[PDB]
Design a protein around this ligand. Structure first.
Ligand SMILES: *[C@@H]1O[C@H](CO)[C@@H](O[C@@H]2O[C@H](CO)[C@@H](O)[C@H](O)[C@H]2NC(C)=O)[C@H](O)[C@H]1NC(C)=O
Ligand SMILES: *[C@@H]1O[C@H](CO)[C@@H](O)[C@H](O)[C@H]1NC(C)=O
Ligand SMILES: *[C@@H]1O[C@H](CO)[C@@H](O)[C@H](O)[C@H]1NC(C)=O
Ligand SMILES: *[C@@H]1O[C@H](CO)[C@@H](O)[C@H](O)[C@H]1NC(C)=O
Ligand SMILES: *[C@@H]1O[C@H](CO)[C@@H](O)[C@H](O)[C@H]1NC(C)=O
Lengths: 103, 231, 106, 128, 111, 109, 105, 105, 105
């Protein structure tokens, strides 16, 4: 019944809508609008860099939804580079920040 | 005593150049000693020069290295290391065979912050890093602070040990110790690990004061133009 | 939402359960979610695991060709009833993909 | 020479209180030089020309070179229980895609309630 | 908490540090009843880098996630030849690292 | 609570109940250092009224409120002759059972 | 999990059969009040006998068949509900086996 | 993001430098009213010059260096605030560049 | 409210003058620690002399002038702050009079 206006996965906002029938009449058919955001309190500021401070402020301009990101995507891989000094050989190596989703 | 150390995955993975070493110790000092390498079919491979100097306590300390193909090692071909000394006319033969690979599995990495009671003492804080359930045993672990690697002597790493709950599984520990002031200055520490199963061969977890079991949840939820124009 | 396939037993002795097999995921579980809290407790899963109660009567066979995985449970009792789920990923709750119901007429 | 801006409006709230009919208005402004006409299609099927009544291009109140036009259409009141969305369209030479289909439905419009349900968790990182 | 999301098992770790000399003894029990010795593993005393001659050790125990959630407490006991009573205990449960307080601040607007 | 609104002292009690036989040993230590036996008192094994063939004791410790508001785990060790290894201990601090507190600050507009 | 669904008659006595586990000292036959989600212990190894059941119930343990039997003498309408039996310091967390009781008169 | 922090004198004229983007037809030099979180368009390619700025401002676009220049003739105390310039149909969503203005007299 | 701003010298002794009220039995000379909004009782009629001040202070009450006098023998840098005196069980909700102390050496 409910149509979907927004399915953003970066902000996990699901804007939907539905019109409910009145008490056996075509009048006062009140419309609805459901919004469901799921805030992550453990994610960092720069989601692709595990050194930036924690994410405190959350700004949601609903107009844009219907680029800084807040949450990860179950269908994608995030990677980075770290210096491994193994054998006295400082070496930048790629690292799967979000493993199990890079297979 | 004749000691043989096979090359580690991390060495072959990072340094790329790979070699296997046989060393002798607890042996009377005697020059003119030959170090050789033998496969299962009898073929000999080139042994490298630049033998290590003897130990100051009047005993041997030598290095012998050779290069064998990584695909050859993956083929599971048995190799033998031999050394010659006049004291023991019969050369000592030892095996450095690589047993291919048993079922591969990814290592779950959990990193935990210091205990609350420990911080009450306001002396020093210890951060741990519990790798878990990796088969086989080949995990290289290291620590860096805010993008700068730390000395290997500032932390201690365990060795793979069997897992009672999971047959054919191994786990390991690692702890780092720092002063309380450093932990209380939002400094950030991470525990990078390296294993064959890892898709990128390297993965990392990170914690700080704010993320390790925090006391308060400061939040600034703010939304605007809720009505807007949505289609 | 995803399908709500339902199965029955017609007296105990054997039962068979099938769920869709997702791609690019290594974990597969059949948690029962039969708890007052609601937190699903994984019964039989890959990555090596099993249920203290459900042992020797539970097995998993993944078939990538049919995009399905198969779990076979021998016999039947009063405890192993109610509902069951299926899914993937590394979060038993929030990672489900079906809601199957198990019942026996005995 | 500017892009012809277009808009659409739904029937009035007080209009849906006599139970006779309803009107939907598609406003076309700009399109310099004045070259537009509107065809009101529903479900991809054009409606009869006798229903929609386009009149003429008219200069904007302050018109350096701009113009505008208005076109309405008449429907039945009892048919709005399902909407059908009664699409509008415009055509002009100063358009990269020469079509700007515009359509609205009972569902589209002013929200009469805002059921926000935000949640806080420490496991939303993946946002499954 | 990351391990808990799997709804399979849980690992409590007991960390003994600073003692000298070696030969410490660690055992696990709940509600005063000793636990089976085939469910936990203990490391041997290992030298401490900065410390001149002090050692450390660590033991881990695996329990069902359900059991942790049920609310059961698990106590860890160490026996060394230097403690005045030669015995010590600690205790952890679900109510250990709960956030002490929330400070949310919604500022809903339409402009 | 009303004891602490005095700024002079506080008393911590260590109730022991349901043991048999008598001769239980209780002493108070702070962060691993046993405290002087003069700083605390102790009751004597007296019978449990509703529970027959049983005993219970008591022990209190006086302490300044200045230092109680800073930490000092203050564990209470008990030495009976029927424990699994003859010794047990418990501890409480200023934040033993503080619950969760919400501070919602809606700026609804 | 298992339910004895034990049945009896008004007056006389009825025996409740519950499993006797090992590595668990306190054994109780809690009554599921099911009021505010709280269960009140009827009898325990701590010699805790409820006042309403004082002098009418007993608990005998004998690890022969890993079973402990509890007998309820006399019977009243009040004695017609759920008496989950279990072990552990927290009564509510235990109560492994569930049973039901009624009156036939 | 970038701030020209352009400066000028009372009277005369001052030129505001803002980036001219591609795939965006409407180009505006909105004034950040910062009253109830609303920005009012001063000028646009759609042809709208605010009444207070009528006959004193102009907007010329030339994709030579990907720049469009806006000139403000005359000057008043009122002309001493923020004029975020941007593109797109929505005005309070663009504001690609922020700038500040003042008066020296 | 009133401040004696009493002054003294290192060593010797200094007398603190504070009002002796009626219908209030507990009389104290609290020291305003002003650390975490807390005041620690230095002396009281209930008999509590802080350890740091043990054997160096005394409190004598006489109804002759609704005044009670407290003497501090010896002196240390530590003895150079605020000693609000008051009555009642709650020490932080009394502090009838505020006073300051210092050292001259
Ligand atoms: C967030 O982190 C990313 C990654 O470090 C930053 O972008 C990288 O910047 C470096 C140079 O500083 C480049 O080598 C990388 O190629 C960039 N990453 C990508 C994906 O292009 C980014 O700038 C950071 N954001 C902030 C605000 O600091
Ligand atoms: C908590 O948030 C406020 C703003 O809402 C900020 O002023 C304060 O610094 C934050 N607390 C910490 C510890 O950063
Ligand atoms: C309001 O939102 C809640 C949460 O999504 C939902 O359960 C409820 O049905 C909604 N009410 C209406 C009238 O849509
Ligand atoms: C608590 O929230 C208020 C309101 O945002 C803020 O002013 C204050 O700084 C916050 N406290 C902390 C410790 O973050
Ligand atoms: C509680 O909320 C009030 C009002 O926003 C704020 O002033 C205060 O700092 C908050 N306390 C904490 C500990 O955040």
């Amino acid at each position: 019944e409910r149509i979907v206006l927004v399915d953003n996965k970066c902000k996990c906002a699901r804007i939907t809508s539905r019109i409910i029938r009145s008490s056996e009449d075509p009048n006062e058919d009140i419309v609805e609008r459901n919004i469901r955001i799921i805030v992550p309190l453990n994610n960092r500021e720069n989601i692709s860099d595990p050194t930036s401070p924690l994410r405190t402020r959350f700004v949601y301009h609903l107009s844009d939804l219907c680029e800084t990101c807040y949450t990860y995507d179950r269908n994608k891989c995030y990677t980075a580079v770290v210096p491994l000094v193994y054998g006295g050989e400082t070496k930048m190596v790629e690292t799967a920040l979000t493993p199990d989703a890079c297979y | 005593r004749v000691f043989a150390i096979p090359p580690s995955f991390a060495s072959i993975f990072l340094t790329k150049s790979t070699k296997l070493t046989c060393l002798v110790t607890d042996l009377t000092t005697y020059d003119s000693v030959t170090i050789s390498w033998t496969r299962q079919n009898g073929e000999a491979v080139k042994t490298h020069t630049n033998i290590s100097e003897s130990h100051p306590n009047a005993t041997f300390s030598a290095v012998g290295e050779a290069s064998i193909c990584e695909d050859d090692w993956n083929s599971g071909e048995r190799f033998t290391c031999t050394v010659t000394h006049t004291d023991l006319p019969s050369p000592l033969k030892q095996t450095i065979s690589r047993p291919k690979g048993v079922a591969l599995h990814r290592p779950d990495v959990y990193l935990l912050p210091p205990a609350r009671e420990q911080l009450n003492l306001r002396e020093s804080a210890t951060i741990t890093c519990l790798v878990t359930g990796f088969s086989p045993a080949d995990v290289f672990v290291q620590w860096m602070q805010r993008g700068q690697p730390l000395s290997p002597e500032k932390y201690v790493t365990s060795a793979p040990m069997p897992e009672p709950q999971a047959p054919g599984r191994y786990f390991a520990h690692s702890i780092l110790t720092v002063s309380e002031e450093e932990w209380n200055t939002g400094e950030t520490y991470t525990c990078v690990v390296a294993h064959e199963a890892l898709p990128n061969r390297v993965t990392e977890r990170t914690v700080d004061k704010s993320t390790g079991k925090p006391t308060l949840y400061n939040v600034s939820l703010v939304m605007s133009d809720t009505a807007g124009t949505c289609y | 939402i995803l399908p709500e396939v339902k199965v029955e037993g017609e007296l105990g002795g054997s039962v068979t359960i099938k769920c869709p097999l997702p791609e690019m995921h290594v974990r597969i579980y059949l948690c029962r979610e039969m708890a007052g809290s609601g937190t699903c407790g994984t019964v039989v899963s890959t990555t090596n695991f099993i249920k203290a109660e459900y042992k020797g009567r539970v097995t998993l066979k993944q078939y990538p060709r049919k995009n399905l995985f198969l779990v076979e449970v021998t016999q039947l009792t009063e405890s192993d009833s109610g509902v069951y789920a299926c899914g993937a990923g590394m979060n038993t709750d929030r990672g489900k993909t079906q809601k199957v119901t198990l019942n026996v007429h005995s």
